[PDB]
């Protein structure tokens, strides 16, 4: 990507804010027990693939 | 009656003895048998142990005593013998086994944890000292894994 | 079997992966505060990615399989002998603190448990003990210069020779007249009403 | 977020090659560095601003 | 303005003069953002059942949690309302002011 801004005389920083999926399904067996599978996929992280 | 009831005579340290330096992996290896995770340092779960990489070293000048009126003279200053004369507090002699501290490296060999199944991107890696207090004097810590299976569950 | 990271094709069981600190260097915004004790490290290493990104991808290792590791640890460390941290640079030992005539004509003598401190790092034996014995003449300095304390009777004094080497149990004195200059052990010489404490600090240990 | 020095004008950046399944589009806007704090950090040395 | 730099009473010095201070106030964030720690792998809450071990909760370095809240919130319903439970009460500028 190349993006083109005015000059300004402080340091800026550009935010992308790429859009992408992120979901989180909680699995929860037994009492008292918590499973979570995330995923986040354009940039991927989590458990399940 | 005396002293020697409740008192033992030890060969002096420098390091004043040696702590136990525990090892805490809290987001990648499971934690032991009786220890629960939680996010203070002072309780990450111990993954393995090992002795300070610091120890005495044992030197000996006999001349001692001798070295150390060279070392007066040399010092130009009679500062730590301000009494010079009462045999009382005159300076104490060099011990002949004297003994200096050193800073060993140390490349321990933990056997085998159980880790979890989905490793972490940003692992922490933390070094605690016998009282769970973290060690402001670590220079260099490295840490190598080799996951292998263990078994399996399927039935 | 299949251990599987995101981008790269599947790899099979026994990898490794490394902990390493400068890695430390490149998410430094998460451990601005932290030490090589406890720190915050990236364990992927891609070289596509910039050093600050691919730090959020996990590595994955298959559910079905109960995943065991091994462990070998590198660790080399600099702490000096006396230090603040532990409990070597501080040290309580009672001592006269005032030696003033009373109304009576009748010398009073008070006490007074003080903390001492040692400048940290000195080392060698020998120069430690000679310094704890600085600390001691200190105080009087401060102190009994000030409230007339006589130097000869000095509460505390450390060293390490055998004072009955010369003793004579048929005169019950030393014949030589002084005391070898041969060390022995480290050990406390006391005057009454004064004392040593190590409740709270480990030089015990070096004073043997 | 991308640096961008004072009085720039131009700003490349590179994604480096990954898979884009499922993308759904984008979203971009300017900040101040000194009102964008360094965060996931317990406490930020140079922070300076409210 | 201060006349003159010489100190203590002076002809000069009463002939000063004043302005009252800027005004400034300060106060919690829009919905207390930052109180609470996220996306901070440092410093990451921890939900699990007492007894289990693993987290339930995985927070990435680069998710924004608070920018998220900010606008759902904004989408579920109007903003320029004021809750003061959670000092829900969304900043905005004079816009005669923003505008000349």
Same mark, same amino acid.
């Given at each position: 990507m190349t993006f083109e801004v005015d000059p300004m005389d402080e340091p800026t920083l550009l935010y992308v804010l790429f859009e992408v999926f992120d979901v989180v399904r909680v699995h929860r067996p037994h009492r008292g027990v918590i499973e979570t599978v995330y995923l986040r996929t354009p940039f991927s992280a989590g458990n399940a693939t | 009656t005396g002293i020697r009831s409740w008192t033992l005579l030890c060969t002096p340290d420098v390091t004043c003895g040696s702590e136990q330096v525990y090892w805490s992996l809290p987001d990648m290896m499971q934690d032991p048998v009786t220890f629960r995770s939680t996010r203070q340092i002072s309780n990450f779960p111990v993954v393995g142990a090992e002795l300070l990489p610091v120890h005495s070293k044992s030197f000996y000048n006999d001349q001692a005593v001798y070295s150390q009126l060279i070392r007066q003279f040399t010092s130009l200053t009679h500062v730590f013998n301000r009494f010079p004369e009462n045999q009382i507090l005159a300076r104490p002699p060099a011990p002949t086994i004297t003994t200096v501290s050193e800073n060993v490296p140390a490349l321990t060999d933990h056997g085998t944890l159980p880790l979890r199944n989905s490793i972490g991107g940003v692992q922490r890696v933390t070094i605690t000292d016998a009282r769970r207090r973290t060690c402001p004097y670590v220079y260099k810590a490295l840490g190598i894994v080799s996951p292998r299976v263990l078994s399996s569950r399927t039935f | 079997n299949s251990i599987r990271y995101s981008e790269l094709a599947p790899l099979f069981d026994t990898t490794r992966v490394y902990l390493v600190d400068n890695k430390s260097t490149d998410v430094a915004s998460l451990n601005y505060q932290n030490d090589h004790s406890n720190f915050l490290t990236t364990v992927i290493q891609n070289?596509?990615? !910039?050093?600050?990104?691919? !730090?959020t991808q996990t590595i994955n290792l298959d559910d079905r399989s109960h995943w065991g590791g091994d462990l070998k640890t590198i660790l080399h460390t600099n702490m000096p002998n006396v230090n603040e941290f532990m409990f070597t640079n501080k040290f309580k030992a009672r001592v006269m603190v005032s030696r003033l005539p009373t109304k009576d004509n009748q010398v009073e003598l008070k006490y007074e448990w003080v903390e001492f401190t040692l400048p940290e790092g000195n080392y060698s034996e020998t120069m430690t003990i000679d310094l704890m014995n600085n600390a001691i003449v200190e105080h009087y300095l401060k102190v009994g210069r000030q409230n007339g304390v006589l130097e000869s009777d000095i509460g505390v004094k450390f060293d390490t020779r055998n004072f009955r080497l010369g003793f004579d149990p048929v005169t019950?004195?030393?014949?030589?007249g002084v005391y070898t200059n041969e060390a022995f052990h480290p050990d406390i010489i006391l005057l009454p009403g004064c004392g040593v404490d190590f409740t709270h600090s480990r030089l015990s240990n070096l004073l043997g | 977020l991308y640096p961008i020095p004072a009085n720039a004008t131009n700003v490349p950046i590179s994604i480096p090659s990954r898979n884009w399944a499922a993308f759904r589009g984008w979203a971009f806007t300017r900040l101040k560095t000194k009102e964008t704090p360094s965060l996931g950090s317990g406490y930020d040395p140079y922070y300076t601003y409210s | 303005y201060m006349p003159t730099i010489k100190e203590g009473n002076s002809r000069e010095l009463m002939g000063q003069q004043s302005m009252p201070n800027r005004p400034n106030y300060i106060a919690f964030r829009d919905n207390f953002i930052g109180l609470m720690y996220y996306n901070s792998t440092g410093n990451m809450g921890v939900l699990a059942g007492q007894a289990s071990q693993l987290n339930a909760v995985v927070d990435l370095q680069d998710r924004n949690t608070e920018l998220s809240y900010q606008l759902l919130l904004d989408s579920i319903g109007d903003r320029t309302r004021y809750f003061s439970m959670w000092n829900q009460a969304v900043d905005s500028y004079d816009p005669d002011v923003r505008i000349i």
């Open positions: - | - | 070289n596509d990615y !910039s050093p600050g990104e691919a !730090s019950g004195l030393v014949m030589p | - | -």
